[PDB]
Each structure stands twice: as structure tokens, then as C-alpha cells.
Design a binder for these strands. Structure first.
Length: 76
RNA sequence: UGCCCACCCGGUCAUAGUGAGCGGGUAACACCCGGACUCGUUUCGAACCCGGAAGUUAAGCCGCUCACGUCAGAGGGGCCGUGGGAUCCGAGAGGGCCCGCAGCCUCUCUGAGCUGGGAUGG
């Protein structure tokens, strides 16, 4: 099932804060292609951000036994 | 020999400039000694001009160090533009993306006189 952790910069008028409540997200999906499509649609729909302005920098699978947030742990 | 170092005539016209301190000449470049004569000072042989040669490396001149100036290279920082495109965004002011190009200032470090034609010295 490969819980993924996607990190990157999204833009609205020179906006960059690489930490954990205005910059990046967590995703649970089979492969990397599925996880990226989720990030584009969720940020593009909820914040009106086109895909020009979303710059994904790091995507990597994290182990299910160590996640800071318990919301993504509970559906495992 | 030599080559480069001064001198005469230059080119480039601060990377070449300015100030301070120091180094260097038995020749050359100068300061220097003197005025009958050419010439001369609205006074002054100071300057210009003429005639000289005892003295000196103190000036000039050349080189070296250090301060500022100037031209570059590298690095930290402040500011920021633009030619083409879209039934792109926005009430507008303005902004984002695609293809094509950059610039200015300020600090810090490191260097910084090259060169053409002719008679003396090494």
C-alpha cells in the first residue's frame, strides 16, 4: 500500500515555508503516479492553484510504524 | 655582445593618477656658478636669454613601501527591468506562466604601466 510522503513548494505570490501546515502533505497509494495526481487535485481544488505553481521536490515511501500524524495511521 | 635602464621625439591618455617616506648616479638627466655680448625683466640675470663649469644625490627625474583614487576578477548583501503569446487571472491597479535577453549599487579579498623611433651607461 506504500504510504507516501510528498514534499514541495507551492506558489501564491512568493510563498515558501517548508515545514508542516502551509507547504506539504502525506498520501497513501499504490505507486508514485497515483500519489502525485492526488496532490495536484487536492491543492488545485482547495486553494485554486494551477499545476504551473506546484513544484514537487521530494517523494519517497515512509515506513508505516513512524509517522508524526495519527490521522494517516488510523486508516491503515 | 647582449638584453633593459635612463635621455630626445612620441602613441595609448588614471590598471598609467595624487601625497608621504625611503633607495639610486664619478657618464647621461638635473640642481648648480656668472653675466662682457644676442635678448631681458611696466622693479629684480628671480623668469626668459647668453657664457660656463667648482660642487651635490638634498630637490626634479627613475625605482620601492604605505595611505587614499582609478580599472578589473572573485565573494557576501540591497534594488530590479524587458521583446513575443493566450476568449490567462483580477472590478481595476497590477500579477502569474510559456519562448527570447539582461542590468545597477554597496561591502570584502587579490592584482595593477604597457608600447613605437634614435644618441649615453650596465
Amino acid at each position: 500500500v506504500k504510504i507516501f510522503m510528498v514534499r514541495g513548494t507551492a506558489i501564491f505570490s512568493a510563498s515558501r515555508f517548508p515545514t508542516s501546515q502551509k507547504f506539504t502533505k502525506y498520501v497513501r497509494a499504490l505507486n508514485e503516479k497515483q500519489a502525485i495526481e492526488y496532490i495536484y487535485s487536492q491543492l488545485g481544488g482547495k486553494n485554486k492553484i494551477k499545476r504551473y505553481n506546484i513544484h514537487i521536490q521530494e517523494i519517497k515511501e515512509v515506513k508505516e510504524d513512524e509517522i508524526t500524524d495519527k490521522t494517516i495511521r488510523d486508516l491503515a
